[PDB]
Design a protein around this nucleic acid. Sequence first.
RNA 1: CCAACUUCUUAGAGGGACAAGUGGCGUUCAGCCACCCGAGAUUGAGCAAUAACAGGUCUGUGAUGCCCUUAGAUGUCCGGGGCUGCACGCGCGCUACACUGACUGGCUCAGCGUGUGCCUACCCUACGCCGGCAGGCGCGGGUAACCCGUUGAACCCCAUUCGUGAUGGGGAUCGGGGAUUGCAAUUAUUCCCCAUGAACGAGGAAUUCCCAGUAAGUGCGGGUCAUAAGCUUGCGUUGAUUAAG
Lengths: 143, 57, 67, 64, 189, 146, 145, 52, 55, 73
Amino acid sequence: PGVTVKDVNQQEFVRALAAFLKKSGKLKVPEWVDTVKLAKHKELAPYDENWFYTRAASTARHLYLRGGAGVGSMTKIYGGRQRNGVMPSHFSRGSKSVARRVLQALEGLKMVEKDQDGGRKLTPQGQRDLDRIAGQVAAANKK
Amino acid sequence: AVQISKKRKFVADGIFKAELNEFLTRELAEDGYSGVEVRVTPTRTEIIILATRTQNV
Amino acid sequence: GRVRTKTVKKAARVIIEKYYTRLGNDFHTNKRVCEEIAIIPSKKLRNKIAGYVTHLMKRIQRGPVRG
Amino acid sequence: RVQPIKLARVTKVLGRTGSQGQCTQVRVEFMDDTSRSIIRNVKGPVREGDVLTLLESEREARRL
Amino acid sequence: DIKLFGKWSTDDVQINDISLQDYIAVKEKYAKYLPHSAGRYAAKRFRKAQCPIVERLTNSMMMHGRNNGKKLMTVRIVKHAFEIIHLLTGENPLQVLVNAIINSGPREDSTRIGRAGTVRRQAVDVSPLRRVNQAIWLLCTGAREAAFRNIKTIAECLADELINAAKGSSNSYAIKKKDELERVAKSNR
Amino acid sequence: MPSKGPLQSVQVFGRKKTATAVAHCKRGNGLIKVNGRPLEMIEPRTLQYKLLEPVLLLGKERFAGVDIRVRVKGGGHVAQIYAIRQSISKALVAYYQKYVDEASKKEIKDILIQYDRTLLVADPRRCESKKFGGPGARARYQKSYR
Amino acid sequence: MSLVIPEKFQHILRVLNTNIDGRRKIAFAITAIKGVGRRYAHVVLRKADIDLTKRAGELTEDEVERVITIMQNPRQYKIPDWFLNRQKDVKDGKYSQVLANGLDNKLREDLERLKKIRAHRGLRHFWGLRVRGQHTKTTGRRGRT
Amino acid sequence: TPCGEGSKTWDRFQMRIHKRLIDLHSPSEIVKQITSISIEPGVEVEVTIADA
Amino acid sequence: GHQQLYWSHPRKFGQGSRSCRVCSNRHGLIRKYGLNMCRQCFRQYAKDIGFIKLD
Amino acid sequence: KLNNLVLFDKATYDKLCKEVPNYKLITPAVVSERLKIRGSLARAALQELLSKGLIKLVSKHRAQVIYTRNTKG
RNA sequence: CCAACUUCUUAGAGGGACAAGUGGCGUUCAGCCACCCGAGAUUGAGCAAUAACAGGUCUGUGAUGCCCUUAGAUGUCCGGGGCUGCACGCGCGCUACACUGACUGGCUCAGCGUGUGCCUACCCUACGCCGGCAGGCGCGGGUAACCCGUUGAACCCCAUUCGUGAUGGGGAUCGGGGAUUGCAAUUAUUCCCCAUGAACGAGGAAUUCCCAGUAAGUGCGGGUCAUAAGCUUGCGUUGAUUAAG
Ligand SMILES: [Mg+2]
Ligand SMILES: [Mg+2]
C-alpha cells in the first residue's frame, strides 16, 4: 500500500536510488572522479567505479532524515577510523570537497535546497520520487 | 565590559578569598587574627575580620 | 557481614528495656516508634537498630533474656 | 582387570583437600546399593547429591 | 517447540548419560531462540549449569583478545555451523553437540604441587561440571587451532570437529588430547 | 479526530545501561514499530528473534488491538534492542492493568516471568568507574621489581 | 567469465625490468614495479579504460603496451601533479613518475648530492644512522652490529 | 605529591555548583527590594534587564 | 641594559611566560579555569577556593 | 604444501561438473583444497553453478556461503 | 492562552533493605546457609589510629638554619649549543604476526566533560564558497541544559574484493613534494600526498594484573597545549571462558 522510505531495507534502497541516478543521466559528475581516495582515513581508491552515484544516493537519504546538514556535517557522517600506522587509530573527518560537490550536483538535479539558517534540506520534488522508488524497491522485495 | 563564565566566576572569588586571607594572616598574626568572612553585593562589599584583639587592629 | 556493632546492640537494648510497652514483632511499626522516641543521626542505623529490636521481640517472648 | 566404568551418587561432602584447595572429598555411593560406599575425591565443584562416574572404582583414600 | 535459530526444535534430543542431565540444559526450561542474553552467571556459584549449552558454547569461542567481546560475531559462527552440521549428517545439531560434550569431557586427571612425576601425580576423579567445562574448552580450542592458517572457515572447522568428536575417532583435537589426559592419569594412577 | 475515546493509552520505558526506550502504545489495530521503522526492518538483524520475542510466545493475532510505537535514546547497538525488548514487554502488561482485568495481566505475566525475567525488570548493573592506578577499574599497571 | 582459459597465458610478463607475476590481477600485479605503488596502479588502469577484475596472464599485448605507456608519461593522461614521485625535481624543475632502475638512480643521486656538500642528512647516510631525527640511544640496534 | 617520589597516588578535588531559574511578570521596580531582603553570602543572584 | 634588547626574547606563548599567581614557579602550573597556581600548593588553598574532596 | 592454480584446465573443470554438484556440503573453502585451485575461483565458479541450477543456495553470508546437493528423486 | 501534562530529561525533598520473612544448622548464643518477595539480599570510592623510617623533597614556596658565592659574580639578561648524542644492557608501553582477517562501500548506536583571558597575545566551532588532501577565506553563534551538539564515535552489523604466499598481513626505514603553528622547524614540531616495503609465523627461563558490566576489545574527552599524545587521568561501548577455595 502506502510504503514510505522508513519501512524498506535501506542498505539496498541505496542500491536502488544509485541505479536510478545512473540511468537518469542528469547528475553533474566531476572530472576528478576516478582519483579521489574518498576521505584520507583510507588508503585505497573506491572499488566501485561509479561510486559517485551511490554516495549521491546515500547523502540524499541522510539529508532526508536530517534537515540542515552541511558540508561539515556530511564529513562527520562519512568519516571513519584512520589507522595511524604504528600509533593508535583515531576517528577522522570525511572529505569536504566530495561532500560539497555532491550537494551542489543534487541541486542541479533539483532535489536539495538551502535553508533559512545554514545547511540543506530537500525539496518536495526531491522527496516525492525517492518515495516513488521506495515503493518500487519494496515491491521489488517481492518481485 | 563583557563578563566571564560562571565556572571561572566561582574560582575567581574563591581565589580572591584565599589571597586576602594570606595577607591578613601575615599582617594580623601578632594581633590574634582568626580568619575573615566576605560578602559581595552590587554595592560596597563588606569584609569582617574575626580578630580576637580588636583593640590592636 | 551481618554482625552488628556495639552501638546498634546497646541502643536497641535501652529501647526494649525502657519502651517495651510500645513495641512488637513488626519491623515497620518499630521503625516508626524508634524514629519518634530516639535521636538517630542517619536513616541507615535507624532501621539497623529497629531490626535488632524485632529480633529481641521473638527472643524475650520465649524466656528470661538479660531482660 | 576389565571394570565397568561405574557411576556413583554422592552423600556428604567432606570439605576441601589437596594442599591448594583444589580437591574435594565426597564419599560416593555406587547407585546399586547404598550399603557400598567409598570415600573418594574429585576436582571441580561438586553440588551435593549429584552423579559422578568412576573410570576405575576403588584405588585409595587420602591418609598417611 | 522453541526452535533455536528459528529451526531444529529440542524435543528429539536426548542426553544419554545420567551423570550430565543436571548440567546440560537443552530442555524446554532452558531452551531459547538464539544464544544471547543478559547473563549474570558468576554472581553466585552453580548457576553456570542451568545456563544453556548453546550459550556456553558461544561464550567460550571468542577467546584471544582480538575477538574478545565480539558476541554478535560468534553467535553467527554457531548459527552457520549448525547448518554445516545438519548437511553432513541429517541429524538435529543439538543432539550431535551434546554427544560431543559427553565424549570430550574427561573422567580422570591428576593434581600435585610437588616433585613432578610427569607434571601432576595424584590421579583424581572429576565433577560433572568440570567435564562440561573441559568439553566446551577442548572443542572451541581445537576448532581454533585447526583454522588459524587455513582457507577453511572457522564455521566449517567448528562443525567438522565436533561431529568428528561426537562419533569419536581421535581425529578431532578434543578426543586425541583428552585421551592423553586419561593416559597420563593411568600413568600415575 | 478525537470523536471517540481520547487518550486511552500509556507510555512505558525499559532500560539497559544507558539505553532508555519508552514505548507509547494506544488502542488500535496491530502495529509495532521503533523510531518510525518496523521491528523486522531493524539494524543488527543477527539478534532478530530477541526483539520480536514478546510477540512470539504471546501471539500476534491475539494481542493485535494495540498500536505500540517506541522512541529510543542513548546506549549502544545491543543495549538499544534489550531496551525495546523490555519496553514493549512491560508496555502491554501495563496497558492491561489500566484498561482490562489483572486476571489477564497475570495470564501474560505468567508467560513473561518463567521465560527469562529480564523482560520486565531493569537489569541494575552499570558503568562502575575507573580508579587512579590502573588501565581500568580493577586491572593494574604492570609492577616490576628488578 | 573464464571457465577454463584462453589459448595463451603468460606465466610471467616482462614490463620495464621486472617480470610481474602472471597469476595475480593487474591492480596488484604491476606493484612489483619499483615506483608503481598500491595506489598508482589503480589510477593508471582507470585511465587505461580496462576492467579491473581481469588477471595478469590474460592481457593481450595491446593492453600491456597501453598500460605501460600511460604509467610512463602520466603527466599528459590527465593524472594530476601531486600524485607523482618526483614533484618539482631538484635538478630540473619538472614533474615525473619514476619506475625503474631510474627510481634507484634518482634515489642515490640525492644521497650522493648531500654527501658531497656535507649536509647533516648526507653525513648520516654516509654513516649508518637515522636521518629523520629519531632517537638512537635504545632503538635500531640491528642495523649496527 | 610535592616531588616525584611515591606510589602514584591521586587526589580528586571537585566542586559541584548548583543553579536555579525563576520567572516573574512583576513591575520591574520592586525587584530592588526583592534584592534587598537578605544578605546571604553563599548565593549569587542576577536580575535580567527589564526590556524582555 | 640598553633597553632595545634587555627583555627582548618574546615571552608570549610558551611555558617561560606562564607562572604561578601565588608562588612564582613556572613548572607544573594549572591553567585550568584561570587558576594559574602551582601544582604543589594548589593543594594548600584547595579548601580556601572551596574544592572539597569526595568528602 | 604451497602455491595452487587459478584459471581451471580442462582436467579439473570436467571433474568439477561431474561430482561437485553431487555431494552434500559444498563451500569455496572445500573445493580450494579438495581440488588444486586456490580460491576466488572457488567463489567465482560455484556462484555460476548456482546460476545454472545444479545446486541449491542455503545461507549466503559474507564470511561464509554454503550450498548443497540438489533434489535427486 | 491561536493546549494540556511530567512517563522519558534535569534536580530537590522524602521513601525504600533491616538479615526483615520463611525453613535448616548453631549452646536454639552470636551468627551462618538456603529460598520467597523485591530495583537491590556484600555498588564503588573517600577519609582513615598508636608508634615510627636517618623513606623522598632545600629543583616547586618571601617555609627555613648553617655553609658557600656576590660584580672577571653561582645574581640576571641576550645569542648559539646541549639535556634527542649510540658496539650495548634493563623497565613501562604502542603496533603486529592475519581469513574469527585486511580492503572498498553501504548501515546504524554514546557518555563523562571542555570552551573568548584583569596581567595573557591566542577559545569552541556551525554554515557558505575555493582545493584531490592537510588546509584557506568570507560569514554567524556561543561567557553556555540558550551555540558547536539530536556531540550521526569506533568496534560491531550488511554486501564486495582477496585467497594461506612474509600476501592486498605488517608499515619500520627512506627520497621528493605540499600546508599549518611560530621570532625561528636544521639534529626531520605536527599534519597531507606519492613512492620505498624491514624484521615479525604467537615468543625460553621467568614474570605481571584480574573473579562481574569485571578482564579484554574499542573509540571519546580533560591534563600538558602557539604548535601537539604511543603518556596520564576520566568516560561510555561490546562483553566473557575460570572461581565462591
Ligand atoms: Mg621550594
Ligand atoms: Mg590466513
